[PDB]
C-alpha cells in the first residue's frame, strides 16, 4: 500500500471495579467511549443519560444485577 | 447377554478415572426410570466382549448391585481417541 | 472549506456580531435565531446573515 | 347504532340461534371500508394531484390526512418522509353511513353491474366492490366531468372467515357473479 496503521487503544481504563471508594466524591462506574451498559440505583441520584453512579460520600461502591433482563446496576453500600 | 455384577464408587474425576482405568476396571452409570442416578465401577472381563455383539444395545441387560439384580438397557459409549480403550458407559433403567 | 465563517447583525444595532459557519456565495439560506448579548445580558435578535 | 340494531337480531340467525351457535356476537359484522386515494404518482409535476383530495366530498365525508411513504425508492422519485396519498378512509360512524349509500340509490346509473366481487375472498371481509369508473351519486346541478375517475373499496372485517362472511354478505342485498 499504503498502510494498515495499527494506531492505539489509548489508556483511561476502568475505575468501577470491586468494593472501593473515595473520600469527598466518587464516580463508581465512570467509563470512556461506552454508554448504556451500566445503570444507577438506590436513593442517591447518579448522572443523567449516561446513568453513571456519582456520590459525594466516603461510602463504597455497590454492584448489583436487577429487574428485567437482569441488567447491571450500581449504588452506594451502607456501613 | 446373561447377568453381570457391579460395585458402588465414591471417589471420582480425572486421576481417579485414570486410576480406575488401569487395565482392570471401567466407570459406569445407571439413570432414568423415575429413580436417581447411581455411580458404579465395573470389572473389565465380560462387558468388553459383550459390546462386540449388536444385541448388547437392542436387548435389555440384568445387572447386580449391592447383591440385588435389576433390568437396564445400553444408551451411550465413550471411547479413547488414540488407543482401542473404553473410557465411560451409560445405562438407562427399564 | 467552501461553507466558511460568517457574522450576523442585530436588531439592537450591537457592535458585537454573532458568528456561525454558513454558505452565502453558492448556497444562501440566511439565519435569524436570537442569542445572548454583551451590553445588557438579556439577548438580542441576530438576523439577516449578510 | 341504527344499522347494527337490525343485524344483531333480525337477520343472519343461522349463525346466532341454529346449530353450533348460541353466542349472538360470534358472527362477523361490518366496521371498516378500505377507501384510499394516492397522490405520490405525480411527484415530478407536484401540482397535478395537489387538489384532487379536496373533491372527494361525494365519496368520503371525512377530513383527509397528509400521509408519508413506506420506503425511499428512486424510480418513483420518492423519499420515506414524502407524502404518498390522502387517506380519507371510512371506519365506524361514516362507514355505515356509506354502506347505506353504496348500491342502494344509484341503481339506474350503472353501465353493466355483472356481479362486482366473484373471487379473492380469504378471511378478513375480502369482498372488493369498487366501481371501475364512477357513476356519480344523485346530487344537485352538476354539468362538467372528467375521464378515468373511480374508487377501490373492500369492506374488511376483524374476522378470520369469508365462508362465515358469505352469510354477512347474504344478510343484506349484494349481487355476486354467477
Amino acid at each position: 500500500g499504503g498502510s494498515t496503521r495499527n494506531g492505539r487503544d489509548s489508556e483511561a481504563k476502568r475505575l468501577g471495579v470491586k468494593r472501593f471508594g473515595g473520600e469527598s466524591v466518587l464516580a463508581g462506574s465512570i467509563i470512556v467511549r461506552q454508554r448504556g451498559t451500566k445503570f444507577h440505583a438506590g436513593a442517591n441520584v447518579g448522572c443523567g443519560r449516561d446513568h453513571t453512579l456519582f456520590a459525594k460520600a466516603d461510602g463504597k461502591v455497590k454492584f448489583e444485577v436487577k429487574g428485567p433482563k437482569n441488567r447491571k446496576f450500581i449504588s452506594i453500600e451502607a456501613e | 447377554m446373561f447377568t453381570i455384577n457391579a460395585e458402588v464408587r465414591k471417589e471420582q474425576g480425572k486421576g481417579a478415572s485414570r486410576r480406575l482405568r488401569a487395565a482392570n476396571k471401567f466407570p459406569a452409570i445407571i439413570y432414568g426410570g423415575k429413580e436417581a442416578p447411581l455411580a458404579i465401577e465395573l470389572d473389565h472381563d465380560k462387558v468388553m466382549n459383550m459390546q462386540a455383539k449388536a444385541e448388547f444395545y437392542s436387548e435389555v441387560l440384568t445387572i447386580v448391585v449391592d447383591g440385588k439384580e435389576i433390568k437396564v438397557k445400553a444408551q451411550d459409549v465413550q471411547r479413547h481417541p488414540y488407543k482401542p480403550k473404553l473410557q465411560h458407559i451409560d445405562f438407562v433403567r427399564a | 472549506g467552501i461553507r466558511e465563517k460568517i457574522k450576523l447583525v442585530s436588531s439592537a444595532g450591537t457592535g458585537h456580531f454573532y458568528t456561525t459557519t454558513k454558505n452565502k456565495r453558492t448556497k444562501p439560506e440566511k439565519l435569524e435565531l436570537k442569542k445572548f448579548d454583551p451590553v445588557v445580558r438579556q439577548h438580542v435578535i441576530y438576523k439577516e446573515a449578510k | 347504532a341504527k344499522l347494527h340494531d337490525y343485524y344483531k337480531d333480525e337477520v343472519v340467525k343461522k349463525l346466532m340461534t341454529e346449530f353450533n351457535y348460541n353466542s349472538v356476537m360470534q358472527v362477523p359484522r361490518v366496521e371498516k371500508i378500505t377507501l384510499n386515494m394516492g397522490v405520490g404518482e405525480a411527484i415530478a409535476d407536484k401540482k397535478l394531484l395537489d387538489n384532487a383530495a379536496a373533491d372527494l366530498a361525494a365519496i368520503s365525508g371525512q377530513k383527509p390526512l397528509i400521509t408519508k411513504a413506506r420506503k425511499s425508492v428512486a424510480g418513483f422519485k420518492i423519499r420515506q418522509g414524502y407524502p404518498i396519498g390522502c387517506k380519507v378512509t371510512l371506519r365506524g360512524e361514516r362507514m355505515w353511513e356509506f354502506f347505506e349509500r353504496l348500491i342502494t340509490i344509484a341503481v339506474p346509473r350503472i353501465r353493466d353491474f355483472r356481479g362486482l366481487s366473484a373471487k379473492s375472498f380469504d378471511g378478513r371481509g375480502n369482498y372488493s366492490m369498487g366501481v371501475r369508473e364512477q357513476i356519480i351519486f344523485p346530487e344537485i346541478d352538476y354539468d362538467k366531468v372528467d375521464r378515468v375517475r373511480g374508487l377501490d373499496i373492500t369492506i374488511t372485517t376483524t374476522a378470520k372467515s369469508d365462508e362465515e362472511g358469505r352469510a354477512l354478505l347474504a344478510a343484506f342485498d349484494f349481487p355476486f357473479r354467477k
Binding site: - | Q51, A52, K53, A54, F56, Y57, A74, V77, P81, Y82 | - | -
Partner: protein, 136 residues
C-alpha cells in the same frame, strides 16, 4: 482441487494441533480408515487416495470422505528472503490427529475394504489403521 470459492479472510495463523478433535466413531458406513498419529494433510493426497480406492472397489458400494482442508496457507513462488508481507494461497492444508476417521465404506466385503484402504494409505504421510462399525 478442494478449496472454497469465497473467503472472508485468506491471511491466517498457521497454528498447532491439539491431538484430540472430533472423530473415532464410524457413522457413514460399516468400515473405515483411522489416522492413528499426528501429521499434515493436502488436497492432492486426498485425490490420490480417492484415485486409489476407485481401482479396488471400481463402481461397487458408496464411498464417504468426512475430511476437507482446515485453513488457507500462504506461500511465495520461488526460494526467497522473507519480508514485505505474506505471499498468496494456491492450496489449503489440515493438521490431522489420531482419532480422525478419514474414509468410510459399506456396500463392499471387509477383506476388500481393508485392501482398498491399504492401497489408499500408501498415498498418505503417516501409518494408518483399519476400523469397524463397533455395533453402536
Amino acid at each position: 482441487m478442494l478449496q472454497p470459492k469465497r473467503t472472508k479472510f485468506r491471511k491466517m495463523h498457521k497454528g498447532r494441533n491439539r491431538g484430540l478433535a472430533q472423530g473415532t466413531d464410524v457413522s457413514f458406513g460399516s468400515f473405515g480408515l483411522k489416522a492413528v498419529g499426528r501429521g499434515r494433510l493436502t488436497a492432492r493426497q486426498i485425490e490420490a487416495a480417492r484415485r486409489a480406492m476407485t481401482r479396488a472397489v471400481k463402481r461397487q458400494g458408496k464411498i464417504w470422505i468426512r475430511v476437507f482442508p482446515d485453513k488457507p496457507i500462504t506461500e511465495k513462488p520461488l526460494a526467497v528472503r522473507m519480508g514485505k508481507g505474506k505471499g498468496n494461497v494456491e492450496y489449503w492444508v489440515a493438521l490431522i490427529q489420531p482419532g480422525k476417521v478419514l474414509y468410510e465404506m459399506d456396500g463392499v466385503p471387509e477383506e476388500l475394504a481393508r485392501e482398498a484402504f491399504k492401497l489408499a494409505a500408501a498415498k498418505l504421510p503417516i501409518k494408518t489403521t483399519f476400523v469397524t462399525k463397533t455395533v453402536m
